[PDB]
Design a protein around this ligand. Structure first.
Ligand SMILES: CCCCCCCCCCCCCCCCCC(=O)OC[C@H](COP(=O)([O-])OCC(O)COP(=O)([O-])OC[C@@H](COC(=O)CCCCCCCCCCCCCCCCC)OC(=O)CCCCCCCCCCCCCCCCC)OC(=O)CCCCCCCCCCCCCCCCC
Ligand SMILES: CCCCCCCCCCCCCCCCCC(=O)OC[C@H](COP(=O)([O-])OCC(O)COP(=O)([O-])OC[C@@H](COC(=O)CCCCCCCCCCCCCCCCC)OC(=O)CCCCCCCCCCCCCCCCC)OC(=O)CCCCCCCCCCCCCCCCC
Ligand SMILES: CCCCCCCCCCCCCCCCC[C@@H](O)O[C@H](CO[C@H](O)CCCCCCCCCCCCCCC)COP(=O)(O)OCC[N+](C)(C)C
Ligand SMILES: CCCCCCCCCCCCCCCCC[C@@H](O)O[C@H](CO[C@H](O)CCCCCCCCCCCCCCC)COP(=O)(O)OCC[N+](C)(C)C
Ligand SMILES: CCCCCCCC/C=C\CCCCCCCC(=O)OC[C@H](COP(=O)(O)OCCN)OC(=O)CCCCCCC/C=C\CCCCCCCC
Ligand SMILES: CCCCCCCC/C=C\CCCCCCCC(=O)OC[C@H](COP(=O)(O)OCCN)OC(=O)CCCCCCC/C=C\CCCCCCCC
Ligand SMILES: CCCCCCCC/C=C\CCCCCCCC(=O)O[C@H](COC(=O)CCCCCCC/C=C/CCCCCCCC)COP(=O)(O)OCCN
Lengths: 121, 347, 99, 105, 129, 98, 71, 171, 83
């Protein structure tokens, strides 16, 4: 595909202004929950490496890890959804503007299509 | 050296890389490469000894030759078209010269010979920096001119790098040479998708950087540079060995680990372009990297090697310094496969 | 042309006179009977090379004074000289100018 | 890869030195200023693939100005034919080309 | 037409390069490189690059090859592609070189930083210990 | 592209080949690198002067400065190697091996 | 005045070259007299070798290196 | 591709100004003061047409005007001008500074005879305007037709249909 | 204030060269931004004609453009003469 050269694109914007027209991801999104799980695993591994009680060494540190992971994951999900929306928009626009390359296939019914039958013996 | 001088040199290396990444003039890219080379040598030679000096002079010779070739390619491109902007190369000969220079900078085969020796000579921190940060600038330059590369040469050197890394990692007992051959193989994987998709190249670069950071930080934590020295790690800090085994399994491309993401996506993208044989050979060859990763895991964590009496004192002491982000790097290099569709962010 | 001829004349005269000096007393018959590698001199040579490079940077100054952007060129020239002085000061304070 | 910091901030760190037709000091023109200007105006906003396929005339003229391969080839052919004719003996140069002409200011 | 003086200088340049590329007795290789640098300076001067040729002949020859020799001593077709008009009442090469302080602010900054870093790097490497 | 450019490119190729030979004497390697940068300087200067591109008269100076700095760095490395082994022989740098 | 004289001199040299070229290349089969090497019809400043290509060596060398060698 | 058109040798015949550089330098200030209109017409045509073959008549006109100027000089102020350009020819740099006396003699002679005032500093370097009947060229560069730009698609963004649609992922 | 005065008096002794160097360098850095003649230098650089002044095509809408060099319209150089 390559959208780097796409027209009217700002050089260092994480989320353009046109991205705000899309529904934001919910706070109960499964991907956000997985990011929180990743942060919790990072906290547990941090506790284990420092030779501390893994489950209950630092509650504030684990909370900070989970919150940071959730925050970054939310913004990443927003950007990903925007990029896929752009891909679909460009696809549909190109299909609209080039009718000769995407003709309507003449619909055909199976009762009048001859398919070879291969017996299993 | 003085910590102020070390910080200034690290900032100069990073600023040279950023100058390469942000400039649109070929002369400025060359200047960024020169600045990075100039500031890199003391970092490699930080712990003064004959081995570090030999590694530094080998690295200097290789990088100076590559920079001279790159300058020659720029001058030929200017000769055949009065252009300084980094765009389409405009000349077949200029493109060939530039590709070889960037391969020499990256260490792609057949220009791989310097990587294992330079990595063995330098310490583990210099090895981490050399194998992680020193790949950004040449890969970015290759990405900017990916539409000009001849696919035959790029694919040939990529497959050669994969084969060379797989074969050369089998023969090593030193951990740094193993990491160097792994880096060569991963570079070969990265450059086999530039003709088709640069997003896959960047995704592979990010995944490999995370995995390599995790592995080098684990090796620094348990100060071992040989297989037998790492075989003593279970008797003091078994958690480090278990995490290292999981990271090694991830680096071998075994699903559902994070390391399966780049190979999967690259194979899928290459198949979209009616290329079938090369991904099959590439996976077959990556089996060798997985094999020597498994040998390291066997020697490290899955079995218990004999220990020594003097480990009883080491049992009584704790690490004075704890490396931040080690936990984050392990998790990111282990458990990010379900987040695969996030690559559309043009990472 | 003129410069080539002048250099050729200088070289020819020097060669002729040196050779006659070395061969006039060669016609009459007579009897006809380490490691140290001081590091300081190398540092002096390297410092000379670096300062010569910065001087080469400073050389286009006589023509840079007619640019209509006097403030910018003054700032840049002062910046170059300040970094030259900074290099000298750094090598001074790091015991790089001692014997 | 490429982070367009200059275009984001409008800095112009190195764009002034990229092309011949971009504000030389004292308005000194490049030798091939017109050809490169025409080629750039042809290919602006069109994209690399279309610029290569459609603006080939302008780029060919620009390369001809830059390296002058065709002009030198033509001059060499003319001089070779003149040499052949003067060796054979049916052509004599005019006084204009023999140094016997009358110069003008 | 002096039998292609530029061609003769180019052949002398290439011959000198073959001379010191054989790498005999590095002092003799340095002498060959000195001859090659002088021939290249002559080429640039005859082309019209007075200041750039003088920069070659001064900086390269008198500093870098001199330091090389010092360190060694410690140890054991043309005339056709030319222009037609004139330049005005100045030399375009000098104007373009002097534009470094009015146009090349970025270049001056990066080059000065690189030179200072090179000084620091030389000091750190030569400390030893 | 006339014959002078071909001669300079041939000089660059000869210098590169001489660098890649390594009979001995790393000082000769540095000499070959400096010959390469000198050839680059000459050929870039000819290109820039021929086309009357005024603003690239800077670039040869920058190239010369940076390459001479690299030369100083290489000389320092060679001096350290020689102080380590007593000679600048190439074959003495065999401690690290593939 | 210098600009006008320069234009007239260049045009005269081009015309003389065209005349001698037409005389010389009369018997070449595929040759065309006064054919441009550019696709565009815009006026292009001639090279040094376009004006003095058929002239004698002394004034070729003059027009090429006189200013450089004048000291 | 095409034939280069050149004017005949007859079109390039004109009565040349056969005076040397010293005479021209001595008379330059009054020459610019008096012969400004044809010179500016010629130079405006020269930077507008970008073609020497389109500016021959103006060159003949400026030659004629310079000839008339020098004929007036010969008719009225021959000998002061002769001494002045004798100065200017003697010097290797042809400096005005060396015999300001002869310059004053020539200036007062021309002021008395033809009523000419020498231009002051900064006057001959001014940018002037030219009233000309020559039509403005429409395509001096002989440019072709520019290729049409890309369609520039625009609209309101909609969510991606069935999400990423990457393998088994439902989002 | 006393410490700075003592430092300056101690540096003026046994190190006069460095004191003079720093004084001259600081003065060279500072004074140009305060002198009023730097604008005069810029204006002088503006008034040096290296190029031919190309005339403009008159359309009856340029009262500020002189028709002849002797016309009062256009920039003047009397200030340069008075300098
Ligand atoms: C499929 C996805 C779904 C599942 C995800 C799978 C992964 C999940 C977890 C990921 C990682 C996060 C946690 C790991 C931290 C490591 C700490 C550790 O070692 O454990 C010690 C610790 C107990 O020990 P301790 O008393 O604290 O102190 C002992 C010292 O820690 C140290 O004791 P020691 O040093 O004396 O003992 C040494 C020992 C200790 O060394 C270790 O055990 C190291 C830990 C393994 C490495 C982890 C790698 C990172 C993640 C990779 C996951 C791979 C999955 C992919 C599938 C392939 C499988 C390999 O090492 C050895 O014995 C050497 C031989 C090793 C044997 C072979 C190695 C195989 C390792 C592969 C493990 C992969 C799965 C991990 C599952 C969790 C394991 C804890 O375990 C825990 O208690 C933490 C476990 C999780 C806590 C859950 C609490 C939440 C429940 C309450 C809320 C309910 C939730 C639901 C909400 C709704 C209800 C209302
Ligand atoms: C280990 C697991 C640790 C805990 C993880 C917690 C989050 C689990 C999310 C996992 C899936 C993430 C995702 O990409 O979802 C998109 C999508 C699910 O979106 P959906 O189908 O619209 O949502 C259905 C929900 O039931 C619709 O529910 P909703 O829209 O009402 O959401 C309310 C929210 C409720 O939020 C909370 O409850 C917050 C407190 C917790 O959802 C949840 O937190 C409950 C979990 C939902 C699971 C959705 C995925 C189902 C297929 C895969 C099941 C894998 C099960 C593994 C263990 C899962 C344990 C939960 O999943 C997929 O596209 C296929 C995923 C297939 C497996 C992943 C691919 C890798 C396979 C190898 C695994 C290797 C693991 C690492 C080694
Ligand atoms: C191991 C997995 C990857 C981890 C990556 C490191 C995590 C920490 C990084 C913290 C966030 C860094 C983002 C920087 C903030 C602003 C970024 C913005 O300004 O830049 C944009 C760029 O945004 C970034 O590229 C997005 C980075 C997001 C990385 C996540 C993708 C990882 C792949 C899927 C694995 C799931 C990982 C989830 C857990 C972290 C615009 O780029 P643009 O100037 O226009 O063009 C340059 C790029 N081109 C050339 C390729 C087109
Ligand atoms: C924005 C973010 C700032 C913080 C991050 C800084 C990153 C590293 C520092 C390097 C960046 C510095 C920015 C300088 C960019 C150069 C362009 C800008 O400065 O404008 C110039 C103006 O020049 C300024 O005067 C430069 C002043 C800055 C240099 C002085 C100090 C530099 C120090 C920077 C770091 C170097 C090492 C550290 C030293 C302590 C152009 O002048 P102008 O005349 O309009 O246009 C010329 C074109 N003409 C001829 C057609 C008209
Ligand atoms: C083209 C490249 C194709 C890539 C093929 C990759 C095959 C995957 C395994 C590669 C292992 C090769 C290395 C090896 O085994 O060395 C012999 C090794 C030496 O032992 P070391 O542990 O190295 O030293 C012990 C003394 N200190 O001997 C062994 O241990 C052999 C035990 C492992 C056997 C594994 C069986 C693998 C073969 C299965 C069939 C398919 C193989 C894969 C390709 C098949 C063809 C499509
Ligand atoms: C400011 C002005 C300075 C000008 C520069 C210097 C000009 C040089 C002028 C040269 C003057 C002539 C010098 C000749 C004398 C040479 C010395 C001499 O006396 O040699 C005697 C020597 C002794 O030999 P034997 O007796 O056989 O054996 C003794 C050993 N058992 O006898 C000879 O060799 C005689 C050599 C023949 C010399 C005759 C020609 C004179 C030379 C003319 C100068 C030529 C160059 C001009
Ligand atoms: C802000 C302006 C910056 C630009 C101007 C500078 C241009 C050139 C000057 C810089 C050159 C490099 C300076 C290097 C500094 C080296 C410092 C040093 O180490 O010197 C000390 C000795 O000197 C010192 O004490 C250090 C510096 C002392 C202070 C110098 C002057 C400080 C400021 C004075 C002027 C203030 C402003 C002037 C106002 C005057 C009123 C008009 C050691 O000397 P030794 O060789 O070891 O000999 C000692 C054995 N007998």
């Amino acid at each position: 595909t390559m959208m780097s050269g796409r027209p009217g694109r700002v050089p260092l914007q994480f989320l353009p202004n046109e991205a705000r027209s899309l529904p934001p991801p919910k706070l109960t999104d499964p991907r956000l929950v997985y990011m929180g799980f990743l942060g919790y695993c990072s906290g547990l591994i941090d506790n284990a490496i420092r030779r501390r009680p893994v489950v209950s060494a630092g509650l504030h540190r684990q909370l900070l890890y989970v919150t940071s992971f959730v925050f970054f994951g939310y913004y990443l999900l927003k950007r990903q959804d925007y990029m896929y929306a752009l891909r679909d928009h460009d696809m549909f626009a190109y299909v609209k503007s080039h009718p000769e390359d995407f003709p309507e296939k003449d619909k055909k019914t199976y009762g009048e299509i001859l398919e070879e039958f291969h017996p299993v013996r | 050296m003085n910590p102020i001088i070390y910080t200034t040199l690290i900032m100069t290396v990073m600023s040279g890389t950023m100058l390469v990444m942000i400039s649109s003039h070929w002369l400025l890219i060359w200047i960024g490469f020169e600045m990075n080379l100039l500031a890199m040598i003391p970092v490699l030679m930080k712990n003064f000894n004959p081995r570090a000096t030999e590694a530094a002079t080998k690295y200097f010779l290789t990088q100076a030759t590559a920079s001279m070739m790159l300058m020659m390619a720029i001058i030929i491109n200017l000769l055949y078209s009065g252009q300084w902007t980094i765009t389409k190369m405009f000349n077949p000969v200029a493109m060939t010269m530039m590709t070889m220079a960037l391969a020499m900078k990256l260490g792609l085969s057949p220009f791989h010979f310097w990587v294992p020796e330079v990595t063995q000579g330098i310490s583990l921190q210099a090895g981490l920096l050399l194998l992680t940060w020193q790949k950004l600038a040449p890969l970015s330059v290759l990405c900017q001119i990916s539409q000009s590369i001849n696919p035959n040469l790029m694919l040939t050197m990529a497959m050669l790098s994969i084969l060379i890394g797989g074969w050369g990692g089998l023969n090593q007992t030193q951990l740094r040479k193993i990491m160097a051959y792994s880096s060569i193989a991963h570079m070969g994987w990265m450059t086999a998708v530039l003709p088709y998709n640069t997003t896959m190249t960047i995704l592979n670069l990010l995944i490999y950087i995370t995995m390599t950071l995790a592995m080098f930080m684990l090796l620094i934590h348990s100060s071992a540079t040989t297989t037998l020295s790492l075989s003593h790690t279970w008797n003091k800090m078994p958690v480090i060995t278990s995490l290292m085994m999981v990271t090694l399994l991830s680096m071998g491309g075994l699903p559902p680990l994070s390391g399966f993401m780049p190979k999967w996506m690259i194979i899928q993208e290459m198949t979209k372009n009616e290329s079938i044989i090369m991904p099959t050979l590439m996976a077959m060859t990556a089996l060798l990297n997985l094999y020597f990763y498994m040998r390291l895991a066997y020697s490290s964590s899955l079995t218990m090697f004999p220990s020594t009496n003097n480990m009883k004192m080491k049992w009584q002491f704790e690490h004075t310094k704890q490396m931040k982000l080690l936990p984050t790097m392990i998790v990111l290099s282990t458990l990010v496969l379900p987040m695969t569709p996030a690559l559309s962010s043009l990472n | 042309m003129n410069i080539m001829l002048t250099l050729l004349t200088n070289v020819t005269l020097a060669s002729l006179l040196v050779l006659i000096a070395f061969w006039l007393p060669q016609l009459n018959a007579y009897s006809e009977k380490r490691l140290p590698f001081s590091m300081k001199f190398f540092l002096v040579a390297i410092t000379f090379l670096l300062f010569d490079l910065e001087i080469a940077l400073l050389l286009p100054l006589p023509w840079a004074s007619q640019t209509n952007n006097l403030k910018t060129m003054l700032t840049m020239a002062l910046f170059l000289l300040i970094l030259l002085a900074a290099s000298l000061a750094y090598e001074w304070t790091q015991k790089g100018l001692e014997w | 890869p490429f982070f367009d910091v200059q275009k984001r901030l409008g800095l112009d760190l190195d764009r002034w030195m990229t092309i011949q037709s971009a504000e030389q000091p004292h308005k000194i023109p490049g030798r091939c200023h017109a050809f490169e200007k025409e080629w750039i105006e042809c290919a602006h906003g069109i994209g690399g693939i279309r610029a290569e396929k459609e603006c080939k005339i302008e780029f060919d003229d620009f390369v001809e100005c830059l390296l002058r391969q065709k002009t030198m080839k033509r001059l060499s052919a003319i001089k070779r034919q003149r040499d052949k004719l003067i060796k054979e003996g049916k052509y004599t140069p005019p006084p204009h080309h023999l140094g016997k002409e009358d110069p003008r200011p | 037409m002096t039998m292609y003086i530029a061609f003769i200088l180019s052949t002398i340049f290439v011959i000198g390069f073959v001379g010191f590329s054989s790498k005999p007795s590095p002092i003799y290789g340095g002498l060959g490189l000195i001859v090659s640098g002088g021939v290249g300076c002559g080429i640039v001067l005859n082309f019209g690059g007075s200041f750039l040729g003088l920069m070659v002949f001064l900086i390269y020859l008198g500093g870098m090859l001199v330091v090389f020799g010092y360190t060694t001593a410690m140890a054991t077709g043309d005339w056709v592609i030319y222009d037609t008009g004139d330049s005005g009442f100045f030399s375009e090469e000098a104007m373009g070189i002097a534009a470094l302080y009015s146009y090349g602010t970025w270049l001056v900054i990066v080059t000065g930083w690189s030179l200072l870093i090179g000084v620091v790097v030389i000091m750190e490497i030569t400390r030893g210990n | 592209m006339p014959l002078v450019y071909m001669n300079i490119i041939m000089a660059f190729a000869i210098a590169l080949a001489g660098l890649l030979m390594y009979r001995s004497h790393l000082m000769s390697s540095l000499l070959c690198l400096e010959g390469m940068m000198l050839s680059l300087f000459i050929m870039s200067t000819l290109i820039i002067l021929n086309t009357h591109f005024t603003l690239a008269n800077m670039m040869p100076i920058i190239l010369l400065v940076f390459a001479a700095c690299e030369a100083a760095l290489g000389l320092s490395l060679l001096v350290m190697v020689s102080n380590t082994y007593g000679t600048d022989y190439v074959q003495n740098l065999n401690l690290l091996q593939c | 005045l210098f600009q006008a004289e320069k234009d007239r001199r260049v045009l005269q040299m081009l015309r003389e070259n065209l005349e001698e070229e037409a005389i010389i290349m009369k018997d070449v089969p595929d040759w065309k007299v006064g054919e441009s090497v550019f696709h565009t019809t815009r006026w292009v400043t001639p090279m040094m070798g376009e004006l003095y290509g058929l002239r004698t060596n002394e004034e070729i060398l003059s027009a090429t290196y006189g200013f450089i060698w004048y000291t | 591709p095409g034939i280069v058109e050149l004017p005949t040798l007859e079109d390039l015949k004109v009565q040349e100004v056969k005076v040397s550089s010293s005479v021209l330098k001595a008379a330059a200030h009054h020459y610019g003061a008096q012969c400004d209109k044809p010179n500016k017409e010629f130079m405006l045509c020269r930077w507008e047409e970008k073609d020497p073959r389109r500016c021959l008549e103006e060159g003949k006109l400026v030659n004629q005007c310079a000839l008339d100027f020098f004929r007036q000089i010969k008719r009225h102020c021959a000998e002061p001008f002769t001494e002045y350009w004798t100065c200017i020819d003697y010097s290797g740099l042809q400096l005005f500074r060396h015999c300001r006396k002869q310059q004053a003699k020539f200036d007062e002679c021309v002021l008395d005879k033809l009523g000419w005032v020498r231009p002051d500093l900064g006057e001959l370097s001014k940018v002037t305007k030219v009233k000309t009947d020559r039509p403005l060229p429409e395509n001096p560069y002989h440019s072709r037709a520019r290729p049409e730009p890309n369609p520039e698609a625009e609209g309101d963004l909609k969510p991606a249909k069935h999400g990423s649609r990457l393998f088994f992922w439902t989002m | 204030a006393g410490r700075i005065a003592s430092f300056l008096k101690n540096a003026w002794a046994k190190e006069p060269v460095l004191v003079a160097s720093f004084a001259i360098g600081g003065l060279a850095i500072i004074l140009p931004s305060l002198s009023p003649y730097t604008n005069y230098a810029i204006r002088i650089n503006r008034a040096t004609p290296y190029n031919y002044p190309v005339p403009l095509r008159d359309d009856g809408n340029m009262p500020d453009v002189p028709s002849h060099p002797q016309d009062p319209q256009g920039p003047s150089l009397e200030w340069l003469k008075n300098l």
